[PDB]
Design an enzyme around this catalytic site. Structure first.
Site, mmCIF file in Angstrom:
data_model
loop_
_atom_site.group_PDB
_atom_site.id
_atom_site.type_symbol
_atom_site.label_atom_id
_atom_site.label_comp_id
_atom_site.label_asym_id
_atom_site.label_seq_id
_atom_site.Cartn_x
_atom_site.Cartn_y
_atom_site.Cartn_z
ATOM 1 N N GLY A 21 0.796 -1.230 0.000
ATOM 2 C CA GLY A 21 0.000 0.000 0.000
ATOM 3 C C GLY A 21 0.826 1.276 0.000
ATOM 4 O O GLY A 21 1.763 1.395 -0.787
ATOM 5 N N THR A 22 0.470 2.274 0.853
ATOM 6 C CA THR A 22 1.190 3.563 0.875
ATOM 7 C C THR A 22 1.721 3.967 2.267
ATOM 8 O O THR A 22 1.316 3.409 3.281
ATOM 9 C CB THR A 22 0.325 4.710 0.273
ATOM 10 N N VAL A 23 2.637 4.940 2.292
ATOM 11 C CA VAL A 23 3.141 5.542 3.520
ATOM 12 C C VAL A 23 2.723 7.005 3.450
ATOM 13 O O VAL A 23 3.016 7.691 2.462
ATOM 14 C CB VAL A 23 4.660 5.356 3.795
ATOM 15 N N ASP A 127 17.021 -5.777 4.707
ATOM 16 C CA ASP A 127 16.692 -4.744 3.693
ATOM 17 C C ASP A 127 17.522 -3.501 3.963
ATOM 18 O O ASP A 127 17.014 -2.383 3.893
ATOM 19 C CB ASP A 127 15.182 -4.419 3.670
HETATM 20 C C1 LIG Z 1 11.951 14.416 0.852
HETATM 21 O O1 LIG Z 1 11.346 13.135 0.678
HETATM 22 C C2 LIG Z 1 11.007 12.426 1.799
HETATM 23 C C3 LIG Z 1 10.928 12.959 3.075
HETATM 24 C C4 LIG Z 1 10.547 12.143 4.109
HETATM 25 F F1 LIG Z 1 10.559 12.663 5.358
HETATM 26 C C5 LIG Z 1 10.267 10.794 3.956
HETATM 27 C C6 LIG Z 1 9.981 9.909 5.093
HETATM 28 N N1 LIG Z 1 9.539 8.667 4.958
HETATM 29 C C7 LIG Z 1 9.471 8.178 6.250
HETATM 30 C C8 LIG Z 1 9.097 6.929 6.773
HETATM 31 N N2 LIG Z 1 8.655 5.811 5.913
HETATM 32 C C9 LIG Z 1 8.816 5.692 4.473
HETATM 33 C C10 LIG Z 1 10.266 5.515 4.064
HETATM 34 C C11 LIG Z 1 10.878 4.239 4.651
HETATM 35 C C12 LIG Z 1 12.252 3.993 4.065
HETATM 36 N N3 LIG Z 1 12.182 3.907 2.591
HETATM 37 C C13 LIG Z 1 11.671 5.172 2.015
HETATM 38 C C14 LIG Z 1 10.270 5.437 2.535
HETATM 39 C C15 LIG Z 1 9.105 6.800 8.162
HETATM 40 CL CL1 LIG Z 1 8.725 5.274 8.870
HETATM 41 C C16 LIG Z 1 9.558 7.835 8.965
HETATM 42 N N4 LIG Z 1 9.969 9.016 8.481
HETATM 43 C C17 LIG Z 1 9.920 9.136 7.147
HETATM 44 N N5 LIG Z 1 10.253 10.228 6.391
HETATM 45 C C18 LIG Z 1 10.285 10.275 2.655
HETATM 46 C C19 LIG Z 1 10.656 11.078 1.579
HETATM 47 O O2 LIG Z 1 10.762 10.656 0.280
HETATM 48 C C20 LIG Z 1 10.373 9.315 -0.031
#
Ligand SMILES: COc1cc(F)c(-c2nc3c(NCC4CCNCC4)c(Cl)cnc3[nH]2)cc1OC
Length: 265
Positions: A21-23, A127
């Site tokens: 799904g999505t985050v 991973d």
């Molecule tokens: C500037 O672009 C970004 C800024 C962001 F702050 C984030 C972000 N994603 C998470 C995240 N989960 C998803 C990421 C898990 C590792 N693999 C990548 C997606 C969690 Cl659990 C906690 N803080 C996060 N911050 C993602 C961003 O670009 C994908």
């Protein structure tokens, strides 16, 4: 561990997808303050996969590992985690080309501290890539994405699978055996990514061509401008034989000592 959906607001901001799904970015009302969160949203087996990930995150407590707030049962199953606002390390270095070597070393050393803790705790990540390293600040990295993570059996130093192949050690590819030393190989790939300003490893190669390259004793070349000590450490992480490959305690120490050489100009 169980969160109230009326206390969660999901922002119109996507942080990742798949799968799964999505985050999404969100805000969670705590006992007094709101906390900024990253919410992994599921969209039968995928449910148990999320709950096992939540079960792994619940057991972990280290400054260099993403903190889970809890799980939320609502329109979809949800995993609520503390937000690292700067995002993934590979994307960050791709967009911020002037980060100093000292700074890259500080970040990868923090990853090695988190992995040393995971190693001591007998969990395997499976991973460990630059895209799964999240930045809280430009000087604070955290390990994330425990979707493939396993708690090792009390009688074995490895998990046997019954895949991010370019980050996997030969014992993973050939025998499906995953140990902390397999995570050290992945860490070497992550270091290469960090010193290549987030370039993808083994560019233009198929998984089977990467396997063949590794089996001939070949490894990725030194990234342009990479410190020699860091490239030498990558090659030590890429030791074919699991037994001669260092564990995270040895890697953490080498990075820590090299960091102080660089900090002192
Ligand atoms: C500037 O672009 C970004 C800024 C962001 F702050 C984030 C972000 N994603 C998470 C995240 N989960 C998803 C990421 C898990 C590792 N693999 C990548 C997606 C969690 Cl659990 C906690 N803080 C996060 N911050 C993602 C961003 O670009 C994908």
């Amino acid at each position: 561990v169980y969160l109230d959906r009326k206390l969660l607001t999901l922002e119109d901001k996507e942080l990742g997808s798949g799968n799964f799904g999505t985050v999404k970015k969100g805000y969670y009302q705590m006992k007094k303050v709101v906390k900024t969160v990253a919410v992994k949203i599921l969209k039968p087996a995928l449910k148990d996969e999320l709950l096992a990930e939540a079960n792994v995150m619940q057991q972990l407590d280290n400054p260099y590992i993403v903190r889970m707030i809890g799980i939320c049962e609502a329109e979809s199953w949800m995993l609520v985690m503390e937000m690292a606002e700067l995002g993934p390390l590979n994307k960050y270095l791709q967009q911020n080309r002037h980060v100093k070597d000292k700074n890259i070393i500080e970040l990868v050393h923090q990853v090695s501290m988190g992995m040393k803790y995971l190693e001591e705790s007998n969990f395997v990540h499976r991973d460990l890539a630059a895209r799964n390293v999240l930045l809280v600040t430009q000087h604070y990295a955290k390990i994330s994405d425990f979707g493939l993570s396993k708690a090792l059996r009390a009688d074995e130093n490895y998990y046997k699978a019954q895949w991010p192949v370019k980050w996997y050690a030969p014992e993973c590819i050939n025998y499906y055996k995953f140990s902390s030393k397999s995570d050290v190989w992945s860490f070497g790939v992550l270091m290469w990514e960090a010193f290549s300003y987030g370039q993808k490893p083994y560019r233009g190669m198929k998984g089977s061509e990467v396997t063949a390259m590794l089996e001939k004793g070949e490894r990725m070349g030194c990234p342009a401008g990479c410190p020699r000590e860091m490239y030498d450490l990558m090659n030590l992480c890429w030791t074919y034989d699991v037994e001669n490959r260092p564990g995270f305690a040895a890697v953490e120490l080498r990075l820590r000592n090299y960091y102080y050489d660089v900090v002192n100009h």
